[PDB]
Amino acid sequence: AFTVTVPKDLYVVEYGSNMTIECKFPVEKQLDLAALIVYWEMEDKNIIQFVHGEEDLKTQHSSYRQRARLLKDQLSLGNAALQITDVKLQDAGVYRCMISYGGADYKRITVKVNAPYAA
């Protein structure tokens, strides 16, 4: 069956750093861009919406403009990787990755953000 996996289900990231959280899904030798739909959400915020080989920025929440992107080259490897630069404290929480690719699945990932003076 179509299953989405997460290598790590809890990310502890430092304030102001860059974060890359990854969901893995099965891909054959070649990637069918028409069939792939990827949606990264947190709380009720539209982070990344990926359809027909391109990110849809018209629905992206303002909290993430030029702050987050889907690394398209990793999709070739069966990796939906969300990268968010300059992590803020308001980026901590539960992220959901939803992937449709023939079959459909989704997984949760928890992100803790470390305060600047916590280490």
Partner: peptide, 14 residues
Amino acid sequence: FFXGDVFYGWYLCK
């Protein structure tokens, strides 16, 4: 998130 029924019930964006 709109798109018909694609991941119906899996998301919270309205």
